[PDB]
Amino acid sequence: GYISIDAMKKFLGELHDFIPGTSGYLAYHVQ
């Protein structure tokens, strides 16, 4: 028996896919 998803806390805020090159998203790396 596992806990039901409905018995758990859920983040209810806005949630977006982070896709660089879209919606103003960008990602970098050290060099």
Next chain:
Amino acid sequence: GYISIDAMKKFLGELHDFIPGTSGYLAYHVQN
């Protein structure tokens, strides 16, 4: 799929059941 148990690192040392009152095992707890 899932990784096979045979591909995992394994602890190969001695492994015993810890049963207080046997084989010299003992356990304690704080008290007021």
Next chain:
Amino acid sequence: SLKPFTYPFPETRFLHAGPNVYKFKIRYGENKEVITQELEDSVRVVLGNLDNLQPFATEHFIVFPYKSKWERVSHLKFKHGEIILIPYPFVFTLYVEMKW
């Protein structure tokens, strides 16, 4: 609001929530709208229980969440326009199995 989840194929997704970006990995063992919604719910649950991951059952699945160190995350910078997004330093792997 999110791209459709890949029901049969394992995938990696970067998610922007609040001030953070999270790295998620989905692994798999008819009405696909419900399936996508419950997978989004599973992600939202993991985000709501960042420090107390435990397996849980949806209407159709058992989700086994795992957290691992996001290596070389200190060498990355994420931005939304001029906003700096804070990467959560752990990667979440969701093993999704069927609720029989």
Next chain:
Amino acid sequence: SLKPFTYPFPETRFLHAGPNVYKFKIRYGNKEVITQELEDSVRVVLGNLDNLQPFATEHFIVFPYKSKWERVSHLKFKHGEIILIPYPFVFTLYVEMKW
């Protein structure tokens, strides 16, 4: 090396390895082979204490989880005169049928 595990019923087992004692909990959902592969799963968990991941045995999928061992600072373990150090986390192995 350990007594057989209770295949159908959930159980808690305290195991002595090296200088330490670990708290394991087994939850479910020829028993000699089952006991042997469960011992192997325990040894794998001990070999990957910091990088827990699910793995498949011949008959099961094992989902290991770590949780804080509460109220363990108030415990002292000994083997004879030797002081055993309790590993401060409890390991719960969710065992599921591989098929």
